[PDB]
Amino acid sequence: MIEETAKKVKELGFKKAGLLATTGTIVSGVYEKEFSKYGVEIMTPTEDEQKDVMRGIYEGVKAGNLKLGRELLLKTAKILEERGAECIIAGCTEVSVVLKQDDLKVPLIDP
């Protein structure tokens, strides 16, 4: 659950979490909402970067082009990280397929 992820992130003392998920999810703003209830901030990529996250999930992972998915998702995760994310949230299972903890400096958490 999004709310359980939020409490866990808060319990780890993190104030800023990076999010890799679908545009539908980011537009609903459900993560920012649930995380705000625990005082935690959600970091999302720019609108163009978000399009590449979408490509990474669908044109990449879901389509079978695992190389492309890894490339685009890893790059986005590394960008959120470099920007200050204390943890990266794998919002879609496709993210966890090509992105693993050994790829990041910060915790990779999935629902």
Supply the residues annotated as catalytic.
92
Number of other residues whose CB lies within 10 A of the CB of residue 110: 14
Report if residue 75 touches Ca ion, rule: CB under 5 A. Answer: no
Question: Any binding-site annotation on 62?
Answer: yes
Among the listed ranges 24-32, 34-42, 69-77, 96-104, the one in contact with Ca ion (CB under 5 A) is 96-104
Give the residue with the Cβ less far from Ca ion, 83 or 100.
Answer: 100
Which member of 29, 36, 100, 101 binds Ca ion (CB under 5 A)?
100
Cα distances (Å, whole numbers) of residue 2 to 9, 14, 62, 68, 78: 11, 15, 23, 27, 22
* CA proximity to 43, closest of 7, 77, 5, 93: 77
Give per-residue burial for 64-79: e unless 16+ CB within 10 Å, then b.
ebeebbbbbbbebbbb
Give the residue with the Cβ less far from Ca ion, 42 or 72.
Answer: 72
Which member of 11, 47, 48, 102 binds Ca ion (CB under 5 A)?
102
Q: How many residues bind Ca ion (CB under 5 A)?
A: 2
In the region spanning residues 44 to 63, those forming contacts with Ca ion, defined by CB under 5 A, are none
Q: Which residues are annotated as a binding site for substrate?
A: 62
Q: Interface residues with Ca ion (CB under 5 A)?
A: 100, 102
